Write a protein that binds this ligand. Structure first.
Ligand SMILES: Nc1ncnc2c1ncn2[C@@H]1O[C@H](COP(=O)(O)OP(=O)(O)OP(=O)(O)O)[C@@H](O)[C@H]1O
Ligand SMILES: Nc1ncnc2c1ncn2[C@@H]1O[C@H](COP(=O)(O)OP(=O)(O)OP(=O)(O)O)[C@@H](O)[C@H]1O
Ligand SMILES: Nc1ncnc2c1ncn2[C@@H]1O[C@H](COP(=O)(O)OP(=O)(O)OP(=O)(O)O)[C@@H](O)[C@H]1O
Ligand SMILES: OC[C@H]1O[C@H](O[C@H]2[C@H](O)[C@@H](O)[C@@H](O)O[C@@H]2CO)[C@H](O)[C@@H](O)[C@@H]1O
Ligand SMILES: OC[C@H]1O[C@H](O[C@H]2[C@H](O)[C@@H](O)[C@@H](O)O[C@@H]2CO)[C@H](O)[C@@H](O)[C@@H]1O
Ligand SMILES: OC[C@H]1O[C@H](O[C@H]2[C@H](O)[C@@H](O)[C@@H](O)O[C@@H]2CO)[C@H](O)[C@@H](O)[C@@H]1O
Ligand SMILES: *[C@@H]1O[C@H](CO)[C@@H](O)[C@H](O)[C@H]1NC(C)=O
Ligand SMILES: *[C@@H]1O[C@H](CO)[C@@H](O)[C@H](O)[C@H]1NC(C)=O
Ligand SMILES: *[C@@H]1O[C@H](CO)[C@@H](O)[C@H](O)[C@H]1NC(C)=O
Ligand SMILES: *[C@@H]1O[C@H](CO)[C@@H](O)[C@H](O)[C@H]1NC(C)=O
Ligand SMILES: *[C@@H]1O[C@H](CO)[C@@H](O)[C@H](O)[C@H]1NC(C)=O
Ligand SMILES: *[C@@H]1O[C@H](CO)[C@@H](O)[C@H](O)[C@H]1NC(C)=O
Ligand SMILES: *[C@@H]1O[C@H](CO)[C@@H](O)[C@H](O)[C@H]1NC(C)=O
Ligand SMILES: *[C@@H]1O[C@H](CO)[C@@H](O)[C@H](O)[C@H]1NC(C)=O
Ligand SMILES: [Mg+2]
Ligand SMILES: [Mg+2]
Ligand SMILES: [Mg+2]
Lengths: 357, 357, 357
């Protein structure tokens, strides 16, 4: 039988419970309108899956080890990705060749060939088993490998000029849920701007060219100490865009920070360095290499974003849930009514029809 | 007191509101079955945290600078990860040596030694302060650095053969939530297929071998212009799988796009190139280098996914929400019944027991 | 009129339905405290958008091709990012120069110059169009390019010492929603620890030093086969932290797996290799190169996390959803009471006030 059910309802008219319920209903409606709808923007579909593309180019010259260094000297790797390192400090060990030689660290002090056993395996090459004089004051164990051994201890200068190098970022973003593409290079960017512009979070926040010193500062870092220890700085590019607004309002927000924080809270591993070698070989077949322990700043360009565009489906579902939530005040209103007018028994009686068996 | 409450209910038996409520209930149930259950598949848990592993290897040979280039020549970096560049154009500066030489851009045109001060610091090398004859017609400032300077301007030809190179992708995906592993190499892939296979959206859509010229076509790009300007193309691999279906139905979808979108929309930065150097030294200790400004296409293999497998918790909660939602039609049915039969007062009286105090 | 509505309610007092509904409600309340609050911890806000930074350094020395190899030889690329390879096997092609020579894979077999045409376009260099003796028993097609060609086929030994190398991971994590930073190097880590510590999932789970052999074992892989074929292992770093608990309890969880899983279930591409060349050039300007096919284990340092901390808003909304969901049992209790107490007719009459017109 096609029958429509619906509850039998009391309709109290006390001025007290009347205004207090109307106030609870007003607060519920305003909370859902201002928060769930305006702020949290539940009326639009959200896309967090951003497509990004970063192309970088470093520019500048520096003085180091009686050489003039250009980008190709101090940037590694060079293909211009969202991660690159700018070498600021280098410990060079020139012209290593395969042979036999003693270690240079005081950690390998010896007086007899009997001590040079399978105990200290890492570092350099393989122990030859002999104990050989490294200097007039020190004897260390002999190893086969790349000779002469590097000295890790003597500090070398840093390339101050790197502070004035320039990082150019080319970022292409696409939100697929809305098929919306934009880049951090607006159409009104000119060649003249590019040759001279200067990024600043306030004075020029759209200039694709970032001064390394500016970035180091923005992360609160001291160029001298950082270029001495090496480290990683993160350049974050945020694309929080409400596409219901104007197209030209989808705009990139720059952030700057230091990513390798653990290094400062450690006296044992304070920075970031890596070792690599330039390989040459003579007219004779023998090979030799220049071994460089490089200290520098690694840069990660981190591009995130989320875009929301209005659709009717989330709007409908949110309005349905809003109407279904306006009712929740009935329980609190029940408590107030049934326990705060002295004649509470009247309402308990009006509402409750007991049964027993 | 162990008491079970339940409300007193009117049960109208009007054929009109009876059928309109029964139809509203059918619409809610059908929307829940077709959309919530079938389409949005709320009966299964979704895992988006896919683990992916990409290994690439390029193949091909080409003529450039009267040389035959193989992979180790035009592929960079070489370790073959989900990112690589295939160089299509090279502006080469052979045999750079650290020394003194004049700049070559008209941007450094001068007549007096006073113009070359510490003002235009970046680029090339460091100004020595003199103004030196660069050619019979032009005078430019001198620099200390890698000599002679690179000339940026004369366009060089492109490696046409790059169009016919082959990109082999090896992709492994794993869903931990369901402990399901699968890869883009189907078990029915043979050595003979590999020896001849062919990626194509229709004729062979599983061949791990993709023609570069094909990929360029698939993003809607003209190979000539792309090899001239450089750019970034994204090869996307999708693993959208309904694990309730068959194991061999979890299949990867290839899509092709160009990621450096701003490049065509820019008159200032139209492509993707970078500069690097081959490092040599004579039998003499003297160092010299070959400088390459490389233009090529970057490939990032982008693997995303989400898999759904049935579990009892999502079905239980969806069915609970359905039963809690069947009641929603009553507000509409209340308004229609209580305000559109002239004797609405009968139902207001049957339903509403007013109160006053 | 500021009026408060509320429904009229039956209040059954049967002992049977009293305890059966109270038990349903007890099960609902206990499920909500134990599951939604204790287990799923809905009383706290979650952030999964973790910011992370990894810096790695490998150490060890090994014998290969009768040379001692250190970090600068076998780690690639070397900048110590979250991805690096420890080359374990090399197929070397010494002293290639630009020229004419026949192919070395049997795939190029010929007897007549008519077979080496523009038919088999890919591979090696450019077919010269002639057919030349590659061996006394075999003839292959001649190509223009780097000569003599590499042989892919002769099996080479592996670098056994690679098993005893050490990988040092330095991970910094940042939860921005709670602005909480920490690193996997606890402040009570000493130099002595670093010099002698030993990672083990049980005995010392915080020593940043991982033996490559240990990593191979934990991912359930045999060093010999991995090192012969090459592959990808994933080192995942997890930060599941309940900030409500102790601060020093935010601890990284290490897991080990092999990522290139398809390699083992496939007869086509069983491992991981790539090719690169050491570039030289003679006293004459002419270039020659040493070509290396590199087999190794790739390492991905994979850092995920989610942090949850108590907030008043999630607790409030969960308690609200709990109180609004306790009502759901009334439908089952309606069914039971109205159809399983013999006096069901009593309750049907007490509850339902029929109407007809
Ligand atoms: N680090 C940097 N500092 C300042 N300007 C830069 C930097 N990198 C690029 N630019 C400028 O941005 C513009 C576009 O960059 P892009 O490198 O794509 O062009 P390009 O002609 O290859 O540049 P160049 O010839 O200067 O290497 C160029 O005019 C270049 O001068
Ligand atoms: N692979 C490894 N195995 C064992 N210990 C390591 C390893 N890598 C680094 N360490 C230790 O941790 C510290 C980290 O040093 P870091 O790489 O930051 O600069 P470094 O002091 O120049 O390193 P090193 O002296 O080892 O070349 C080192 O002093 C070293 O003792
Ligand atoms: N870009 C490519 N184009 C065509 N075939 C390829 C490509 N990359 C790999 N292959 C083939 O796919 C298979 C998987 O390659 P893999 O590198 O694992 O084997 P390989 O023997 O080292 O290959 P190669 O013959 O290049 O040495 C090989 O048989 C190789 O011939
Ligand atoms: O709430 C977001 C919503 O977006 C999409 O829904 C589509 C639907 O899939 C299409 O068939 C279309 O007809 O209706 C909606 C229009 O936006 C997603 O498919 C869906 O998963 C999601 O709920
Ligand atoms: O193939 C074995 C598979 O059977 C079941 O899968 C069902 C699935 O649950 C349904 O949604 C249906 O439409 O498709 C399948 C039947 O072909 C279960 O998943 C399980 O028993 C098993 O994995
Ligand atoms: O999920 C967390 C939630 O945090 C933020 O909400 C804040 C709000 O911004 C503050 O004004 C604070 O007083 O109230 C909330 C605390 O939870 C974000 O606004 C919001 O997007 C985010 O969901
Ligand atoms: C940066 O450039 C300015 C002007 O060219 C100069 O005063 C300053 O010393 C430079 N910075 C460094 C670290 O050399
Ligand atoms: C380019 O136009 C945008 C549009 O609002 C504006 O923000 C920007 O200032 C313009 N560019 C310059 C260099 O002023
Ligand atoms: C190769 O010749 C060079 C001289 O060019 C010499 O120094 C070197 O020792 C020779 N190689 C060997 C293994 O002796
Ligand atoms: C690419 O291959 C086609 C046939 O596949 C051939 O006709 C064409 O000439 C090749 N392109 C180049 C630049 O050699
Ligand atoms: C391999 O299997 C897939 C589906 O598993 C099928 O589409 C494809 O055609 C098969 N390939 C061959 C060569 O049979
Ligand atoms: C590695 O060291 C262990 C113990 O230190 C030893 O059992 C093994 O022989 C060593 N292997 C190599 C290749 O050095
Ligand atoms: C350092 O502290 C951690 C946690 O507080 C502890 O697990 C570890 O045992 C401590 N280190 C040593 C060497 O005891
Ligand atoms: C370059 O010189 C080398 C010997 O140093 C010789 O083998 C080669 O044929 C020469 N090539 C040219 C083009 O001069
Ligand atoms: Mg040291
Ligand atoms: Mg230029
Ligand atoms: Mg081969």
């Amino acid at each position: 039988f096609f029958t429509y059910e619906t509850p039998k309802v009391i309709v109290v008219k006390s001025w007290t419970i009347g205004i207090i319920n109307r106030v609870v209903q007003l607060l519920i409606i305003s909370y859902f309108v201002g928060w769930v709808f305006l702020h949290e923007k539940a009326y639009q579909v959200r896309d967090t899956a951003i497509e990004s593309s970063v192309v970088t180019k470093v520019k500048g010259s520096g003085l180091y080890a009686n050489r003039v260094m250009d980008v190709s000297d101090y940037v590694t790797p060079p293909q211009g990705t969202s991660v690159f390192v700018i070498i600021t400090k280098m410990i060079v060990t020139e012209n290593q060749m395969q042979g036999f030689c003693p270690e240079s660290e005081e950690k390998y002090r010896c007086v007899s060939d009997s001590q040079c056993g399978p105990e200290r395996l890492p570092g350099g090459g393989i122990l030859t088993g002999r104990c050989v004089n490294y200097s007039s004051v020190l004897r260390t164990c002999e190893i086969q490998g790349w000779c002469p051994t590097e000295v890790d201890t003597v500090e070398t200068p840093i390339m101050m000029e790197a502070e004035n190098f320039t990082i150019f970022i080319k970022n292409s973003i696409r939100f697929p849920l809305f098929n919306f593409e934009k880049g951090n290079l607006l159409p009104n960017l000119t060649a003249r701007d590019m040759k001279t512009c200067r990024f600043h979070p306030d004075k020029d926040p759209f200039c694709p060219i970032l001064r390394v010193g500016d970035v180091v500062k923005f992360a609160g870092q001291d160029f001298a100490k950082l270029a001495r220890t090496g480290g990683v700085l993160g350049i974050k590019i945020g694309w929080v865009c409400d596409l219901d607004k104007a197209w030209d309002q989808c705009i990139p927000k720059y952030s700057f920070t230091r990513l390798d924080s653990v290094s400062e809270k450690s006296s044992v591993s304070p920075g970031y360095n890596f070792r690599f070698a330039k390989y040459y070989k003579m007219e004779n077949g023998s090979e030799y290499r220049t071994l460089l322990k490089a200290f520098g700043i690694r840069f990660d360009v981190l591009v995130y974003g989320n875009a929301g565009k209005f659709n009717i489906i989330p709007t409908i579902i949110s309005s349905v849930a809003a109407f279904t939530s306006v009712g929740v005040g009935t329980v609190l209103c029940d408590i107030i009514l049934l326990n705060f007018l002295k004649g509470a028994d009247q309402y308990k009686a009006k509402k409750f029809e007991e049964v027993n068996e």
